[PDB]
């Protein structure tokens, strides 16, 4: 939601419905050029806040351990699907070869 | 523009006087230009916009919903023609190209209601009885009667604006 | 729209007088418009409407959900033909193909109700009684009696309110 | 649906005019078709649904749980047949299988409360002589006794409504 | 269910007229059926409820405390007998063994109070004379004398809600 | 439970009727079971309840602290003899082992108050007169005097409430 307006009147609902899209191209700053709001006749601005957010979806470490588990469980290091420094790649593979095949 | 004229408030009224006097024919000729103008209407015919335009924008909205027929429309003083463009209901055209930036010139004609809704007559004539009653107080108690007014609100009676509200635009 | 005629509010005051008072009568005319307004109706037969349009939607809600029977869809000035989408009740359209983008044209026929039920001719009634006895105060006391009136909301006397909300649209 | 008809109120009132007047006859017929509303039923026989469903999901609810039978269920217009679910009360279905993803449409004959019970039969009348009195006020003092109304809430006398909201769908 | 009848109101009152009015007797009717239902109870005989169950947990609470015997129950359609559980006062269920993970559909006889206990019976009598003397108000002045009534709480008078909910489930 | 009876309450009074009016009557044997119940006592004589258990407790709390006597415990249906715990006042229950984890089964009898305390049989007569003075009121202007009734609490009178709370257990 970007804004709510809120009246105890009662309102045209197809002039209403045509002020929600003015107001909706108006504002954006890609469409158009306005900003400054004037209301009258007693339509009041409520604030509100966002009741949940994408933010605490920190999924980042729990589907990191899932892809561990799996690329334990056939053995392979992870260096092997990363790739790393010469002193890290080089005996990996030797590690990977001698003690899963 | 005119919602009442003395014969509606006669009939509304039961009126049997042979003639109205002055106090009530001027607020009938104040009310229908005051609720032409609490509206947001106003009694021109032909208007004239100015608006800004951009190439992401293709929906443009007339100043007034009642706009019947676009006249003349041009940018940056470039005419263009009315193969390039659709107009709706409500006063929207849509373009059927994506302009060039800057400034939109149009002319159109405005029209109006027809015909007027019997409640705009009616509330017309309720207001003019407020003001010739002169019911702007709060309580009155001439010999023993005894009445308390409305609360009203943007000082218009509360029994007025319902009326108004359902049709003031935007 | 009539909710009510002059036969219907007969009945409900029971009135013997040979006719109505044409304040009576204006008031049942104004009545009709305000309570088809009110509830966010229109006395329109066939209504055109623009609908924006994306590939990842197919559900598309018409203006009033009264609406019967499509008569032309079209996007982009692309007709597409009835196969193409089925409609539901509450003027529920469901696209069978996932649209192009962009705007949808559509006209439609949106009937109404039938028949009127007896609430909002009731209703109606009450809303002429109240503008006809002028019971727009707070109190009176004429004579000996007293009354306080509603705690109207809205401006709309609290106890005609409810009958509007159990239909107000939207 | 009728909750009371004139005998009815005759019992309740044990009224010996040998007629009703129109008045209250009317506000019968409203009575019934409000009360039928406020309760959130309405008064079709059969109902056609159209809910959104996902593989993850198989319970359904109808939308009333009066639902007494389904007649027709199809996914994408797909037809499945009786065995592949369980029809419980209150209008729940179960799924014996895990749907496709999509919409499902679904025809059901909705029934309704039998026998109807004594309490919106006595809310009804209360109803039909809060009308009929006008009781729809703050105060009176005709003569000189005097009465003080309920404090009413959604418009609803405080009495009535608590016998509604025992039975308030959703 | 039946809280109260004629007679046991005819001995709270002291009525000697030799009958009841049809005012008196459906209000008696109501009471019951309005009692039976702020409670939580209802007037069924033999119940079906559907419970998720997981093999976590054992300790399952049947939705009528009342319930007097478990008839059938079932997990996802395969049927278990009564050695596998055990039944215990207020509709709780422990299982003896942990389920499958799943849908549980069981059927139960529901009881009720027995005998009906003598607060319930004075309660619905001081109900049926707040209807019948129409003290749903907030003042009366009649003659010289005059009272005023409780503050009401959820539109149940304040005396009469104690009681009720000495008793109400949930 | 009998708090008072027809004979305790005619002391209270000194009435000199010769019998108590049905209405009286009634109002005792309701007195009785509320102040009974408002206790949080009950009328039960054997008492079963299950209790969960863990090794690290020892101390466990019986339901009624009136309970004069354990007549079986068991866990997880295997008996333990009494030796193996003692039995305190306040329905206090200490282990003298270290019990495995799970659910406890106890029976035991609840006893009661005795004699009954001469406070608790005036608070009856006063809820008696409560009700049968009707004073459930907020005041009274019969002829000339004129009284106002207490600030009541959880809708018991507050004169009354005190000597409750001075048992109301937990």
């Given at each position: 939601i970007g804004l709510i307006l809120?009246?105890?009147?009662?309102?045209?609902?197809?002039?209403?419905?045509?002020?929600?899209?003015?107001?909706?191209?108006?504002?954006?700053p890609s469409t158009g050029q306005s900003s400054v709001?004037?209301?009258d006749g007693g339509m009041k601005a409520k604030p509100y806040s966002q009741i949940s957010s994408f933010k605490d979806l920190d999924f980042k470490e729990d589907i990191a351990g899932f892809n561990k588990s799996i690329?334990?469980?056939?053995?392979?290091?992870?260096?092997?699907?990363?790739?790393?420094?010469?002193?890290?790649?080089?005996?990996?593979?030797?590690?990977?070869?001698?003690?899963t095949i | 523009m005119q919602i009442i004229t003395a014969e509606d408030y006669r009939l509304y009224?039961?009126?049997?006087?042979?003639?109205?006097?002055?106090?009530?024919?001027?607020?009938?000729?104040?009310?229908?230009?005051?609720?032409?103008?609490?509206?947001g209407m106003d009694d021109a015919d032909a208007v004239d916009q100015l608006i800004n335009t951009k190439p992401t924008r293709k929906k443009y909205f007339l100043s007034s919903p009642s706009a019947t027929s676009v006249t003349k429309m041009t940018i940056n003083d470039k005419e263009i023609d009315p193969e390039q463009y659709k107009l709706y209901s409500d006063g929207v055209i849509l373009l059927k190209f994506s302009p060039p930036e800057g400034y939109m010139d149009v002319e159109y004609t405005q029209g109006g209601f027809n015909p007027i809704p019997e409640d705009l007559k009616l509330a017309a004539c309720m207001l003019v009885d407020h003001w010739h009653k002169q019911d702007y107080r709060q309580a009155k108690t001439?010999?023993?009667?005894?009445?308390?007014?409305?609360?009203?609100?943007?000082?218009?009676?509360?029994?007025i604006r319902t009326i108004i509200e359902v049709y003031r635009r935007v």
């Open positions: 809120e009246t105890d009147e009662i309102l045209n609902k197809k002039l209403r419905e045509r002020k929600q899209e003015e107001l909706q191209l108006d504002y954006n709001l004037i209301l690329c334990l469980a056939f053995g392979v290091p992870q260096v092997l699907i990363d790739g790393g420094n010469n002193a890290n790649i080089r005996p990996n593979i030797e590690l990977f070869y001698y003690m | 009224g039961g009126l049997k006087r042979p003639e109205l006097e002055s106090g009530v024919e001027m607020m009938i000729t104040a009310a229908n230009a005051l609720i032409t103008s609490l509206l001439i010999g023993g009667e005894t009445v308390t007014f409305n609360n009203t609100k943007s000082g218009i009676p509360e029994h």
